[model samples]
Target: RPVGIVHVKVVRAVGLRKKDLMGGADPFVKIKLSEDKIPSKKTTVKHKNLNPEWNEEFKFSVRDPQTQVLEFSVYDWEQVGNPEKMGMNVLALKEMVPDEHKAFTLELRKTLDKYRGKLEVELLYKPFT
Candidate 1:
Protein backbone atom coordinates (compact mmCIF):
# COMPACT_ATOMS: atom_id res chain seq x y z
CA ARG A 1 0.00 0.00 0.00
CA PRO A 2 1.19 3.53 -0.74
CA VAL A 3 1.84 5.58 2.38
CA GLY A 4 0.61 9.20 2.78
CA ILE A 5 3.09 11.78 3.96
CA VAL A 6 3.15 15.45 4.95
CA HIS A 7 6.09 17.83 4.39
CA VAL A 8 6.46 20.97 6.48
CA LYS A 9 8.79 23.97 6.21
CA VAL A 10 9.29 27.13 8.29
CA VAL A 11 10.54 30.29 6.62
CA ARG A 12 11.58 33.11 8.91
CA ALA A 13 10.99 36.75 7.98
CA VAL A 14 13.85 38.49 6.14
CA GLY A 15 15.31 39.77 9.44
CA LEU A 16 13.55 37.74 12.18
CA ARG A 17 15.59 34.73 13.17
CA LYS A 18 15.51 32.34 16.09
CA LYS A 19 18.80 32.29 17.98
CA ASP A 20 18.27 28.77 19.37
CA LEU A 21 15.72 26.26 20.56
CA MET A 22 15.99 25.21 24.17
CA GLY A 23 15.63 21.59 25.25
CA GLY A 24 12.03 20.27 24.98
CA ALA A 25 11.10 23.32 22.96
CA ASP A 26 9.87 22.01 19.58
CA PRO A 27 7.22 23.38 17.20
CA PHE A 28 4.06 21.39 16.66
CA VAL A 29 2.11 21.25 13.38
CA LYS A 30 -1.17 19.32 13.20
CA ILE A 31 -3.85 18.41 10.65
CA LYS A 32 -7.48 17.85 11.51
CA LEU A 33 -9.26 14.90 9.96
CA SER A 34 -12.56 15.50 8.22
CA GLU A 35 -15.82 14.31 9.67
CA ASP A 36 -15.76 11.26 7.44
CA LYS A 37 -12.04 10.63 7.37
CA ILE A 38 -10.26 8.71 10.08
CA PRO A 39 -6.52 8.08 10.46
CA SER A 40 -4.82 5.24 12.20
CA LYS A 41 -4.33 5.82 15.91
CA LYS A 42 -0.66 4.94 15.51
CA THR A 43 0.00 7.62 12.91
CA THR A 44 3.13 9.60 13.72
CA VAL A 45 5.89 11.70 12.21
CA LYS A 46 9.57 12.43 12.78
CA HIS A 47 10.71 16.01 13.53
CA LYS A 48 14.00 17.62 12.56
CA ASN A 49 15.87 20.90 13.25
CA LEU A 50 15.58 23.52 16.00
CA ASN A 51 16.68 26.69 14.26
CA PRO A 52 14.66 29.40 12.52
CA GLU A 53 14.22 27.06 9.59
CA TRP A 54 12.70 23.64 10.31
CA ASN A 55 11.68 20.63 8.25
CA GLU A 56 9.55 17.73 9.36
CA GLU A 57 8.08 14.66 7.63
CA PHE A 58 5.05 12.79 8.90
CA LYS A 59 3.77 9.42 7.62
CA PHE A 60 0.43 7.99 8.53
CA SER A 61 -2.00 5.33 7.36
CA VAL A 62 -5.49 6.30 6.27
CA ARG A 63 -8.19 4.14 7.67
CA ASP A 64 -10.91 5.82 5.61
CA PRO A 65 -11.25 8.43 2.89
CA GLN A 66 -12.47 11.88 3.97
CA THR A 67 -11.63 15.58 3.70
CA GLN A 68 -9.46 17.11 6.45
CA VAL A 69 -8.77 20.56 7.95
CA LEU A 70 -5.45 21.63 9.47
CA GLU A 71 -4.29 24.12 12.12
CA PHE A 72 -0.82 24.97 13.58
CA SER A 73 0.84 26.34 16.75
CA VAL A 74 4.38 26.83 18.19
CA TYR A 75 6.03 26.42 21.61
CA ASP A 76 8.87 28.20 23.50
CA TRP A 77 12.27 26.66 24.10
CA GLU A 78 13.20 26.06 27.73
CA GLN A 79 16.44 28.04 27.63
CA VAL A 80 15.50 30.68 25.05
CA GLY A 81 13.45 33.86 25.38
CA ASN A 82 9.74 33.79 26.21
CA PRO A 83 7.54 32.14 23.56
CA GLU A 84 5.34 35.24 23.36
CA LYS A 85 8.02 37.66 22.18
CA MET A 86 10.03 35.36 19.99
CA GLY A 87 7.95 35.92 16.83
CA MET A 88 7.15 32.36 15.76
CA ASN A 89 5.45 31.38 12.52
CA VAL A 90 4.15 28.10 11.06
CA LEU A 91 3.55 26.55 7.61
CA ALA A 92 2.18 23.20 6.45
CA LEU A 93 2.04 21.15 3.22
CA LYS A 94 0.01 18.00 2.65
CA GLU A 95 0.60 16.55 -0.82
CA MET A 96 -1.45 13.39 -0.62
CA VAL A 97 -4.65 15.41 -0.32
CA PRO A 98 -5.46 17.66 -3.30
CA ASP A 99 -7.30 20.46 -1.46
CA GLU A 100 -4.52 20.47 1.10
CA HIS A 101 -1.97 21.61 -1.51
CA LYS A 102 -2.20 25.29 -0.54
CA ALA A 103 0.56 26.45 1.84
CA PHE A 104 -0.81 27.70 5.16
CA THR A 105 1.15 30.30 7.11
CA LEU A 106 0.38 32.24 10.34
CA GLU A 107 2.14 34.32 13.00
CA LEU A 108 1.49 35.45 16.59
CA ARG A 109 0.94 39.22 16.12
CA LYS A 110 -1.69 40.98 18.44
CA THR A 111 -4.13 41.02 21.48
CA LEU A 112 -6.81 40.10 18.98
CA ASP A 113 -3.41 38.72 18.04
CA LYS A 114 -2.62 37.81 21.63
CA TYR A 115 -0.04 35.31 20.48
CA ARG A 116 1.75 38.01 18.57
CA GLY A 117 5.53 37.65 18.78
CA LYS A 118 5.12 34.16 20.17
CA LEU A 119 7.99 31.88 19.19
CA GLU A 120 6.34 28.67 20.37
CA VAL A 121 2.98 26.98 19.74
CA GLU A 122 1.13 23.64 19.62
CA LEU A 123 -1.77 22.57 17.40
CA LEU A 124 -5.05 21.18 18.71
CA TYR A 125 -6.71 18.35 16.76
CA LYS A 126 -9.97 16.42 16.77
CA PRO A 127 -10.21 13.57 14.29
CA PHE A 128 -13.61 12.32 13.24
CA THR A 129 -13.30 8.57 13.42
Candidate 2:
Protein backbone atom coordinates (compact mmCIF):
# COMPACT_ATOMS: atom_id res chain seq x y z
CA ARG A 1 0.00 0.00 0.00
CA PRO A 2 1.06 3.55 -0.68
CA VAL A 3 1.88 5.94 2.10
CA GLY A 4 -0.14 8.73 0.51
CA ILE A 5 -2.28 9.63 -2.46
CA VAL A 6 -2.23 12.97 -4.22
CA HIS A 7 -5.46 14.03 -5.84
CA VAL A 8 -5.18 16.55 -8.63
CA LYS A 9 -7.86 18.23 -10.65
CA VAL A 10 -6.88 19.80 -13.94
CA VAL A 11 -8.87 22.97 -13.89
CA ARG A 12 -8.15 25.25 -16.85
CA ALA A 13 -5.63 27.31 -18.76
CA VAL A 14 -5.67 30.87 -20.05
CA GLY A 15 -3.77 33.26 -22.35
CA LEU A 16 -2.26 30.59 -24.54
CA ARG A 17 -0.41 31.46 -27.71
CA LYS A 18 -0.84 29.90 -31.15
CA LYS A 19 1.58 27.08 -31.75
CA ASP A 20 0.37 26.14 -35.20
CA LEU A 21 0.04 28.23 -38.36
CA MET A 22 -3.71 28.02 -38.00
CA GLY A 23 -5.49 30.77 -36.06
CA GLY A 24 -6.60 28.50 -33.23
CA ALA A 25 -5.09 25.77 -31.06
CA ASP A 26 -6.31 22.50 -29.62
CA PRO A 27 -4.83 22.35 -26.16
CA PHE A 28 -4.41 19.37 -23.88
CA VAL A 29 -2.73 18.93 -20.53
CA LYS A 30 -0.33 16.23 -19.33
CA ILE A 31 0.60 15.62 -15.72
CA LYS A 32 3.18 13.47 -14.00
CA LEU A 33 5.27 13.11 -10.92
CA SER A 34 8.69 14.52 -11.69
CA GLU A 35 11.49 12.01 -12.27
CA ASP A 36 9.15 9.05 -12.51
CA LYS A 37 9.18 6.80 -15.60
CA ILE A 38 5.50 5.82 -15.55
CA PRO A 39 3.23 7.10 -18.30
CA SER A 40 1.85 10.57 -17.73
CA LYS A 41 -1.88 11.18 -17.49
CA LYS A 42 -3.52 13.47 -20.03
CA THR A 43 -6.70 15.47 -20.17
CA THR A 44 -9.12 15.36 -23.10
CA VAL A 45 -8.27 17.76 -25.87
CA LYS A 46 -10.22 20.98 -25.64
CA HIS A 47 -10.28 22.19 -29.22
CA LYS A 48 -9.51 25.82 -30.06
CA ASN A 49 -9.98 27.15 -26.58
CA LEU A 50 -7.30 29.15 -24.85
CA ASN A 51 -9.29 28.96 -21.66
CA PRO A 52 -9.82 25.23 -21.64
CA GLU A 53 -11.50 23.68 -18.66
CA TRP A 54 -11.06 19.97 -18.09
CA ASN A 55 -12.10 19.69 -14.42
CA GLU A 56 -10.73 16.18 -14.52
CA GLU A 57 -9.27 14.38 -11.54
CA PHE A 58 -6.30 12.03 -11.25
CA LYS A 59 -4.39 10.36 -8.44
CA PHE A 60 -0.75 9.54 -7.78
CA SER A 61 0.65 7.09 -5.28
CA VAL A 62 3.45 8.63 -3.32
CA ARG A 63 5.90 7.46 -0.69
CA ASP A 64 7.74 10.66 0.14
CA PRO A 65 6.31 14.12 -0.34
CA GLN A 66 9.61 15.93 0.03
CA THR A 67 11.11 14.20 -2.93
CA GLN A 68 8.16 14.36 -5.30
CA VAL A 69 6.84 17.17 -7.42
CA LEU A 70 3.97 17.36 -9.88
CA GLU A 71 4.61 18.49 -13.41
CA PHE A 72 1.95 20.09 -15.54
CA SER A 73 2.82 20.33 -19.20
CA VAL A 74 0.64 21.99 -21.81
CA TYR A 75 0.82 21.04 -25.44
CA ASP A 76 -0.75 22.21 -28.65
CA TRP A 77 -2.02 18.94 -30.11
CA GLU A 78 -2.19 18.75 -33.86
CA GLN A 79 -2.90 16.39 -36.72
CA VAL A 80 -0.54 17.69 -39.41
CA GLY A 81 2.44 19.36 -37.86
CA ASN A 82 4.41 18.09 -34.91
CA PRO A 83 2.88 18.85 -31.54
CA GLU A 84 4.41 21.83 -29.73
CA LYS A 85 4.87 22.44 -26.07
CA MET A 86 2.85 25.48 -25.09
CA GLY A 87 4.12 25.82 -21.55
CA MET A 88 4.83 24.00 -18.31
CA ASN A 89 4.55 24.40 -14.55
CA VAL A 90 5.59 22.31 -11.56
CA LEU A 91 4.35 22.06 -7.99
CA ALA A 92 6.30 20.63 -5.11
CA LEU A 93 4.44 17.94 -3.19
CA LYS A 94 5.64 19.19 0.15
CA GLU A 95 3.29 22.15 -0.10
CA MET A 96 0.15 20.07 0.20
CA VAL A 97 -0.23 18.26 3.50
CA PRO A 98 -2.64 15.39 3.95
CA ASP A 99 -6.35 16.21 4.39
CA GLU A 100 -5.95 19.67 2.98
CA HIS A 101 -7.37 21.07 -0.24
CA LYS A 102 -5.61 23.90 -2.02
CA ALA A 103 -5.84 25.63 -5.36
CA PHE A 104 -2.97 26.90 -7.41
CA THR A 105 -2.58 29.41 -10.20
CA LEU A 106 0.74 28.76 -11.85
CA GLU A 107 2.54 30.79 -14.43
CA LEU A 108 3.43 28.73 -17.46
CA ARG A 109 6.70 29.49 -19.17
CA LYS A 110 7.81 28.44 -22.61
CA THR A 111 11.32 28.32 -21.31
CA LEU A 112 13.13 29.63 -18.28
CA ASP A 113 12.62 33.14 -19.70
CA LYS A 114 9.71 33.29 -22.17
CA TYR A 115 6.18 34.08 -21.17
CA ARG A 116 3.54 31.60 -22.28
CA GLY A 117 0.34 31.22 -20.22
CA LYS A 118 -1.30 30.28 -16.94
CA LEU A 119 -2.63 27.05 -15.50
CA GLU A 120 -4.90 26.34 -12.52
CA VAL A 121 -5.35 23.16 -10.54
CA GLU A 122 -6.94 21.92 -7.34
CA LEU A 123 -4.83 19.67 -5.14
CA LEU A 124 -5.60 17.43 -2.21
CA TYR A 125 -3.51 14.95 -0.26
CA LYS A 126 -4.62 11.99 1.82
CA PRO A 127 -2.36 9.97 4.08
CA PHE A 128 -2.69 6.33 4.93
CA THR A 129 -4.15 5.57 8.32
Candidate 3:
Protein backbone atom coordinates (compact mmCIF):
# COMPACT_ATOMS: atom_id res chain seq x y z
CA ARG A 1 0.00 0.00 0.00
CA PRO A 2 1.14 3.50 -0.78
CA VAL A 3 0.54 6.62 1.31
CA GLY A 4 1.60 10.11 0.37
CA ILE A 5 0.67 13.55 -0.82
CA VAL A 6 0.84 14.76 -4.37
CA HIS A 7 1.39 18.39 -5.24
CA VAL A 8 -0.08 19.61 -8.49
CA LYS A 9 0.75 22.99 -9.90
CA VAL A 10 -1.27 24.44 -12.75
CA VAL A 11 0.88 27.02 -14.46
CA ARG A 12 -0.91 28.28 -17.56
CA ALA A 13 -2.66 27.50 -20.80
CA VAL A 14 -1.80 28.51 -24.35
CA GLY A 15 -3.51 28.66 -27.75
CA LEU A 16 -6.90 27.72 -26.36
CA ARG A 17 -9.78 27.68 -28.78
CA LYS A 18 -12.18 30.56 -28.38
CA LYS A 19 -15.40 29.04 -27.11
CA ASP A 20 -17.21 32.33 -26.87
CA LEU A 21 -18.04 34.01 -30.14
CA MET A 22 -18.55 37.52 -28.76
CA GLY A 23 -15.24 37.74 -26.93
CA GLY A 24 -12.81 35.08 -25.81
CA ALA A 25 -13.47 32.26 -23.41
CA ASP A 26 -13.45 32.89 -19.67
CA PRO A 27 -11.41 29.87 -18.80
CA PHE A 28 -10.51 28.01 -15.61
CA VAL A 29 -9.52 24.57 -14.54
CA LYS A 30 -11.01 21.92 -12.27
CA ILE A 31 -8.67 19.39 -10.76
CA LYS A 32 -9.51 16.06 -9.18
CA LEU A 33 -7.98 12.76 -8.39
CA SER A 34 -9.76 9.81 -9.98
CA GLU A 35 -12.02 7.67 -7.77
CA ASP A 36 -12.21 10.26 -5.02
CA LYS A 37 -15.54 11.53 -3.69
CA ILE A 38 -14.34 14.91 -2.50
CA PRO A 39 -15.22 18.02 -4.47
CA SER A 40 -12.74 19.16 -7.09
CA LYS A 41 -10.36 22.08 -6.68
CA LYS A 42 -10.60 24.96 -9.12
CA THR A 43 -8.52 27.78 -10.49
CA THR A 44 -9.62 31.37 -10.83
CA VAL A 45 -11.29 32.26 -14.09
CA LYS A 46 -9.39 34.45 -16.52
CA HIS A 47 -12.00 36.54 -18.25
CA LYS A 48 -11.98 36.69 -22.05
CA ASN A 49 -8.53 35.26 -22.33
CA LEU A 50 -7.34 32.43 -24.54
CA ASN A 51 -3.88 32.37 -23.05
CA PRO A 52 -4.47 32.28 -19.30
CA GLU A 53 -1.93 31.97 -16.55
CA TRP A 54 -2.92 30.32 -13.31
CA ASN A 55 0.18 29.37 -11.30
CA GLU A 56 -2.24 27.78 -8.85
CA GLU A 57 -1.25 24.94 -6.57
CA PHE A 58 -3.25 22.10 -5.03
CA LYS A 59 -2.59 18.95 -3.06
CA PHE A 60 -4.18 15.51 -2.74
CA SER A 61 -3.81 12.63 -0.33
CA VAL A 62 -2.56 9.54 -2.06
CA ARG A 63 -3.55 6.21 -0.63
CA ASP A 64 -2.57 4.26 -3.72
CA PRO A 65 -0.39 6.35 -5.91
CA GLN A 66 0.52 3.49 -8.17
CA THR A 67 -3.04 3.27 -9.44
CA GLN A 68 -4.36 6.77 -9.00
CA VAL A 69 -4.41 9.44 -11.66
CA LEU A 70 -5.01 13.17 -11.71
CA GLU A 71 -7.82 14.50 -13.89
CA PHE A 72 -7.63 17.99 -15.31
CA SER A 73 -10.68 19.61 -16.86
CA VAL A 74 -10.64 23.00 -18.54
CA TYR A 75 -13.94 24.83 -18.76
CA ASP A 76 -15.23 28.04 -20.16
CA TRP A 77 -17.12 30.01 -17.54
CA GLU A 78 -20.42 31.70 -18.37
CA GLN A 79 -22.53 34.33 -16.72
CA VAL A 80 -25.55 32.03 -16.92
CA GLY A 81 -26.05 28.28 -17.13
CA ASN A 82 -23.42 25.62 -16.48
CA PRO A 83 -19.87 26.03 -17.68
CA GLU A 84 -18.86 24.60 -21.03
CA LYS A 85 -16.11 22.04 -21.21
CA MET A 86 -13.27 22.94 -23.50
CA GLY A 87 -10.71 20.22 -22.99
CA MET A 88 -9.20 17.74 -20.52
CA ASN A 89 -6.39 15.29 -19.89
CA VAL A 90 -5.21 12.76 -17.31
CA LEU A 91 -1.85 12.23 -15.59
CA ALA A 92 -1.10 8.80 -14.28
CA LEU A 93 0.61 8.78 -10.91
CA LYS A 94 2.51 5.63 -11.72
CA GLU A 95 4.81 7.64 -13.92
CA MET A 96 5.91 9.89 -11.07
CA VAL A 97 9.01 9.30 -9.02
CA PRO A 98 8.68 9.86 -5.31
CA ASP A 99 10.14 13.09 -3.93
CA GLU A 100 11.00 14.46 -7.33
CA HIS A 101 9.35 17.42 -8.98
CA LYS A 102 8.60 17.26 -12.69
CA ALA A 103 7.16 19.57 -15.26
CA PHE A 104 4.89 18.70 -18.13
CA THR A 105 3.25 20.39 -21.08
CA LEU A 106 -0.04 18.72 -21.93
CA GLU A 107 -2.00 18.92 -25.13
CA LEU A 108 -5.63 19.43 -24.21
CA ARG A 109 -8.13 17.33 -26.11
CA LYS A 110 -11.78 16.34 -26.17
CA THR A 111 -12.24 12.55 -26.06
CA LEU A 112 -10.21 11.23 -28.98
CA ASP A 113 -9.61 13.84 -31.66
CA LYS A 114 -10.64 17.31 -30.63
CA TYR A 115 -7.54 19.46 -30.31
CA ARG A 116 -8.38 22.17 -27.86
CA GLY A 117 -5.25 23.73 -26.39
CA LYS A 118 -2.11 23.29 -24.30
CA LEU A 119 -1.59 23.34 -20.54
CA GLU A 120 1.58 23.66 -18.43
CA VAL A 121 1.80 21.84 -15.11
CA GLU A 122 4.22 20.64 -12.45
CA LEU A 123 3.96 17.70 -10.04
CA LEU A 124 5.71 16.36 -6.99
CA TYR A 125 5.08 13.28 -4.85
CA LYS A 126 6.02 12.76 -1.20
CA PRO A 127 5.45 9.43 0.46
CA PHE A 128 4.54 9.18 4.12
CA THR A 129 6.55 7.16 6.52
CA lDDT for candidate 2: 0.86
Residue 64, model 1, lDDT: 34
- Residue-level lDDT tens digits of model 1 in 14-114: 22324344232233333333332544221122123233444333333333333333334344333336432334332332223432433444555421133
State model 1's lDDT.
0.33
What lDDT does each candidate get? 0.33, 0.86, 0.90
Model 3 TM: 0.94
Lowest summed lDDT across 10 adjacent residues in model 1 is found at 40-49
User: Which tens-of-lDDT digit does each residue in 15-107 have in candidate 2?
Assistant: 888776765688999999975778999999988777888999999988788989999999999887766788898899988777878999999
Tens digits of lDDT, candidate 3, 39-129? 9999999999999999999999887987888989999999999999999999888988988889998888885265688999999999887
Clashing pairs in 1: 73-121, 74-120, 74-121, 75-120, 75-121, 87-117, 108-116, 109-116, 110-113, 110-114
Q: Estimate each model's TM-score.
A: 0.34, 0.91, 0.94
Looking at model 3, residue 22 earns an lDDT score of: 69
Worst 10 residues of 2 by lDDT: 109-118
In the predicted model 2, the residue pairs found to clash are none
Q: Model 2 — TM-score against the truth?
A: 0.91
TM-score-based ranking:
3, 2, 1
